[PDB]
């Protein structure tokens, strides 16, 4: 029945002034990238990006949703522009960086990595960081959004006028996406 693309995060709402926020940035960035694409979700990765075979699904998910029961919602801020790669700087991205709340995202990361060990799945990246992924685009375009443009977006997030849809997320759940299958969870 197939080996399925697995992977666990904690969900963003994307409230309209977050969106509205976007149409800002995104036309910015555009500007020195045209080709940058507006994600479609939004979410702050707990794990990496697994195959997993079709049969471990269910268990996956009912092993997940007992270790982070025992979890409490609570609140970050994602207010620093980033601009990365994947490891092979074949795609770029733009992000919002967690700075408070880091240290509960790797909490709940060392919670999930116990379920990926038990399913002999790859554990979280080694040195790890947080951010909602805001757009994208093919190639390696660090030399073209870093410096000049990534200082342009940060004064546009600077000049939000600390609007709690950045400085003050308040976490609600767990979610894995098995294939085309999305399984959600409750904070506490
Ligand atoms: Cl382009």
Not at 156 to 174: C, Y
């Amino acid at each position: 029945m197939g080996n399925w693309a697995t992977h666990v995060y904690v969900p963003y709402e994307a409230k309209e002034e977050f969106l509205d926020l976007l149409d800002v940035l995104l036309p910015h960035a555009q500007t020195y990238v045209p080709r940058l694409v507006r994600m479609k979700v939004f979410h702050l990765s707990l794990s990496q990006s697994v195959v997993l075979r079709h049969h471990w699904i269910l268990p996956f998910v009912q092993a997940l949703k007992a270790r982070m029961t025992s979890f409490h919602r609570f609140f970050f801020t994602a207010n620093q522009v980033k601009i990365y790669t994947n490891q092979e700087k074949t795609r770029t991205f733009i992000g919002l960086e967690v700075t408070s709340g880091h240290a509960q995202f790797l909490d709940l990361v060392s919670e999930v990595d116990r379920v990926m060990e038990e399913f002999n799945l790859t554990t979280f990246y080694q040195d790890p960081s947080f951010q909602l992924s805001l757009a994208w685009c093919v190639g390696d375009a660090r030399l073209q959004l870093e410096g000049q443009c990534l200082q342009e977006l940060q004064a546009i997030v600077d000049g939000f006028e600390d609007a709690e849809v950045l400085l003050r997320v308040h976490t609600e759940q767990v979610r894995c996406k098995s294939g085309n299958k999305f399984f959600s969870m409750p904070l506490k």
